Write a protein that binds this ligand. Structure first.
Ligand code: BTN
Ligand code: BTN
Ligand code: BTN
Ligand code: BTN
Ligand code: CL
Ligand code: CL
Lengths: 121, 123, 123, 121
């Protein structure tokens, strides 16, 4: 179920995700990406489902980062959807969608999809 | 888009999205889905990139809804990633990922993908 | 759907899809994209699940196009996964993944996702 | 570039992918999944781009499997889109879409998305 979601997590690209999970299902924190048109920290907000089921399943959650801060504005946003699994080795396994603002003409290629796995290691 | 995004929006399935965009790039609201293991409203939170470009580009944004409220708990969460295009007929075009909590064995089938188009209602 | 799928189809972007469905569940044809780093026709191959169900369910199918022909090489490939719904107005609703070849460092940005709806033309 | 794509590959679920790559860009073979409403082998057909670029990049490719054979018909099809990287440890990194045939009513939940990594180990 929910619990040790709060913390500093890192993914395979070396990005850093620092989050706080509130008792009612809210997620707040900052994100720093190791790749892309990004630099320093960005604000993130999400939600996680605070009453996961009791057949050892993961806890579903998701969050968003709009890539604008006081250093850069990449006119895009990424949303990560996945589930947390705690235990000896806790992991957050996600799939994400990165949409950039385009003109109608380029709207067909506005969205990248990928997957990231986060650990506190 | 903060004034332009704020409002009531509906999508092709008949689901309702009520949102407020804050000066800081924040999006907060409630979502009511016309389909699925959902009932009543659910809280949503997201962000939108406040200073787009001039030009006729869309404003990127995204939000999340964990499908748990006082009436139902579906143990899943959906994230919508898309762009807002304003105008007389403003629209928000998105693609979404719906992940259900699963055992490690069934994790390969935990995520659904789709796309929704939202139309804003007057006011 | 083998007779129903066989034909010329166009999607919202103005791209052409000419296909033949074989008794064995095979799909073979050519694709012409209205957008992207593409020119002329490209070969496509796919499969479709020949014995659907009775009922008013769609026929699942999917196909791939590697964007290389005698005129252009974009070093990318797109796969479309969707369902065929026949009737007077038959449609093929799909979601696709377009992967470009990259270095390991840029692999995180190698795949685009989208959705296309195709309309069959008479004959 | 292209080359040792032909062979028997296995993914993290233990599924087996046996493919033959033709000199003009065709891929043919069989697929056996370790999970899902599937059993025994299924026919697969795909394409790979036979002239990848010369900045050590992967070779883009994709293939499809309709899940019907003489044992089962799951009324679905999966398409894998990704790139091959050869070398000491060759890998095929993909993202896939699994669409099941549904009624219009259930069309919103007809497609699963996931990612698989294949090795010859
Ligand atoms: O380039 C941009 O548009 C802004 C930075 C995007 C970074 C992406 S989001 C998904 C992937 N996971 C990460 O940790 N960073 C990249
Ligand atoms: O069934 C669930 O797990 C919760 C309800 C999911 C409803 C989905 S979210 C994406 C799509 N868009 C909608 O408006 N409703 C469905
Ligand atoms: O630019 C490329 O790499 C090759 C052309 C890609 C065209 C894409 S495939 C999905 C979408 N549907 C179309 O008909 N065209 C675009
Ligand atoms: O259950 C079905 O509809 C048929 C079997 C699906 C097996 C899937 S395809 C993606 C993932 N990768 C595998 O090797 N098998 C599963
Ligand atoms: Cl606010
Ligand atoms: Cl044939």
């Amino acid at each position: 179920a929910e619990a040790g979601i709060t913390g500093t997590w890192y993914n395979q690209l070396g990005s850093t995700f620092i989050v706080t999970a509130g008792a009612d299902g809210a997620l707040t924190g900052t994100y720093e990406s190791a790749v892309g048109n990004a630099e320093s920290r960005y604000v993130l907000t999400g939600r996680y489902d605070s009453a996961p089921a009791t057949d050892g399943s993961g806890t579903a959650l998701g969050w968003t980062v709009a890539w604008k801060n006081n250093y850069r504005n990449a006119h895009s946003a990424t949303t990560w959807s996945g589930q947390y699994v705690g235990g000896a080795e806790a992991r957050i396994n996600t799939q994400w969608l990165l949409t950039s603002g385009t003109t109608e003409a380029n709207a067909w290629k506005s969205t990248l999809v990928g997957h990231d796995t986060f650990t506190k290691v």
